[PDB]
Amino acid sequence: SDLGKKLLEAARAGQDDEVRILMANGADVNAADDVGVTPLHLAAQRGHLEIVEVLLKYGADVNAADLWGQTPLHLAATAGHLEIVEVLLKNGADVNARDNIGHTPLHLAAWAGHLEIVEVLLKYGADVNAQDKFGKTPFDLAIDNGNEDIAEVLQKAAGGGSGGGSGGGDVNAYDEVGWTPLHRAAWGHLELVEKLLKNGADVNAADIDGYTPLHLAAFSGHLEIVEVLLKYGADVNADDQAGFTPLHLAAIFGHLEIVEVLLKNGADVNAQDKFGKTPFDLAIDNGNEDIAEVLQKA
Amino acid sequence: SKGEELFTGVVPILVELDGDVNGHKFSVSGEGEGDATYGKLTLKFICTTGKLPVPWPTLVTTLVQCFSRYPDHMKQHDFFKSAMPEGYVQERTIFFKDDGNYKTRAEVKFEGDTLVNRIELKGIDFKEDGNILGHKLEYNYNSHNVYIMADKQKNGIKVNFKIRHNIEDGSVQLADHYQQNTPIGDGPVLLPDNHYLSTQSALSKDPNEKRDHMVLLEFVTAAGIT
C-alpha cells in the first residue's frame, strides 16, 4: 500500500532502477490510486518502455481501466508511443477497448495523428468501423482534424478504398450536431465546397442549431464560398434559431464584400433577429459604419 | 507568446465553484489533469456541502478552455493560452429555455504549476417543478459546437453556443450560453479570427465515492481556420 504509492511515483517518473527495487521489495504491480490509475497506465502514457515491459512480466493487468474507462493502450496510442503499443498488444491488450466516450485506441491514434500506430492497431484487429458515443468513426476523427494520410489508410481498410484523404462517403451524411460535409467545408475549403455541390450536396441543410452552410461561411468570412453557395441555390435569408440571417452575421463581423453579395442575391435588410435587431442595427452596434451606409441605401 | 509553452504536457487542474441557485447554496471542488496537446480533460468533481441542488450536467460548462486542442496551423488564434499564466476572467449568462438562468464569473489562471478555475455562480428564477430544480435531466452529455469571436474593444473574446440537455422523457432542454473572456494581465494576448471548437464529453460515477459527485472525461478541439 505504502509501497504501492511509491511504485506509482517511480513508474510515472520513469525511474527504472527504483521500479525494480520497489518490486523486489514486494510492491503490488496492480496498485491503483484513487482514480484507478496503475503503474502500467503511467509508464505506458509517459513512454517508459522498459518499465512497461517489466510490469507486464510481473503480471500487471494489461486491460486495467481508470475512472474514465481508459486502459494503458488508450494512453499509449494517444501519445504515439509505438513500441509500447506493440508490447501492450503482444501482452493481451484489448485492441478495441473503449474509454468512457466510446473511443477505441484506433479512434485515439487517428485523433492524435499517429499514422504508424493506426497501421499497427489495424494489423492487430482494430475495428475500423467502430463508432464512439457521438457516432464518430476513426476515419471521421481523422477527416475532422485534417489528418488526411490516416483518412486514406482507414477508408481503404474499411473496404471503400481510394480517395479517403479528401473526404469520403455520402455527401449528405450528417453527424450528431447535424453537420454535413458542406458544413465542414464552408470554413474556407472553397474547392471542396464546389465539388460537394456539384455532387448533389444539400446546399440548405440546417445543423442542430439551425445553421446552414451559408451561415457558417458568412460567420467565417469566406467571400468566394458565400458566392458559390448562392450560385447553387443557398437560401439567402435562412434564419437560425437566434433569428440571424447570413446578412446579420456579415453585418456583425464587418464583411463588406459579403454584405454586397448577399444584397445582390436578395438578402432582406428588414429581417429581425430574436432581439428585434436588423442587419443595419447590428452594423451600428458593432462599429461597422461603412456597411451601415450600404444597408441603409438598400 | 509563451503562454502556450505552459501546456505542452500534462497539467494538474483544480476547480472551485461557489454556487447559489434560488437560495440553495452549494460548493463544488474538482481535481484532475488536462493535456491540451490532445484536448483532453480527466476530472472528478465533488459537491462538498452535501447534495447538489441542481443536476450535475447543468454545471459542466461552468466547471478551462485553455485545454482545447489548437492545431499547429491555428496557434495564433488561441486566446486562452495566450493569456497565461496570469490568466483570464470568464463570464457567462446561461439561459435555460422556459426556466431560470445562471450568471457566472470565473478566474482561470496558474497558481504554481496548477491550472486553477475559481467560479462564482448565481442562479435565479428557476421553476420548482422545472427540469433543473425537478432533476429531470438525464446523466449524460452531448457534443456541441462552440463559436469563438474576437472582442477587440475589450482585448478579449466573445463566445456563443447552445447546450442541449437530454430530458428523461426524450425531450431536450436548451441552455443558451453567452460568454465573454478578458485577460487578467497587461501582457499581449492573441485575438482570434472567427472559428469554432467541437466538444465530446462523458459523465460517470466513482464506485468508491460516497459523496455527491461527477466523473468527467472531455475532448475538445479547435477547428475552422485553414
Residue numbers in the entry:
A (entry chain A): 12 to 309
B (entry chain B): 2 to 64, 68 to 230
Give verbatim lines from the article:
To connect 3G124nc and either YKKD or YRLK we chose flexible GS-linkers. Therefore, two linkers of 7 and 11 aa named GS7 (GGGSGGG) and GS11 (GGGSGGGSGGG) were tested for linking 3G124nc with either YKKD or YRLK. The resulting four constructs were named gc_K7, gc_K11, gc_R7 and gc_R11 according to whether they contained YKKD or YRLK and the linker used was 7 or 11 aa long. The complexes crystallized under various conditions with different unit cells and one to four complexes per asymmetric unit (AU). All GFP-clamps form 1:1 complexes with eGFP, in which the clamp indeed wraps around approximately half the eGFP molecule and creates a continuous large interaction surface, similar to the superposition of the two parental DARPins on GFP (Fig. 4(a,b and c)). The buried surface area (BSA) of the GFP-clamp complexes is 1625 ± 72 Å2. Between 7 and 11 hydrogen bonds were found in the different structures. Hydrogen bonds of Trp79 from the GFP-clamp to Leu44 of eGFP, Trp79 to Leu220, Gln81 to Lys41, His114 to Gln204, Asp143 to Gln204, Asn156 to Arg73 and Phe226/230 (numbering for constructs with different linker lengths, respectively) to Asn198 seem to be the most crucial ones, since they are found in almost all complex structures. The structures of the GFP-clamps confirm the intended design: both DARPin-derived domains overlay well with the parental DARPins when superimposed on eGFP. Most interactions between the DARPins and eGFP are found in the single DARPin complexes as well as in the GFP-clamp complexes, confirming that both domains can bind their respective epitope without strain or steric hindrance.
DARPins are engineered proteins that consist of 4–5 structurally similar repeats that stack on top of each other, forming a compact protein domain. DARPins combine all potential advantages of single domain binders over antibodies: they are small in size (ca. 18 kDa), possess high biophysical stability, have very high expression yields in E. coli, can easily be genetically encoded for in vivo applications and are devoid of disulphides and hence well suited for applications where they are expressed in the reducing cytoplasm. Structural investigations showed that these DARPins bind to different but slightly overlapping epitopes.
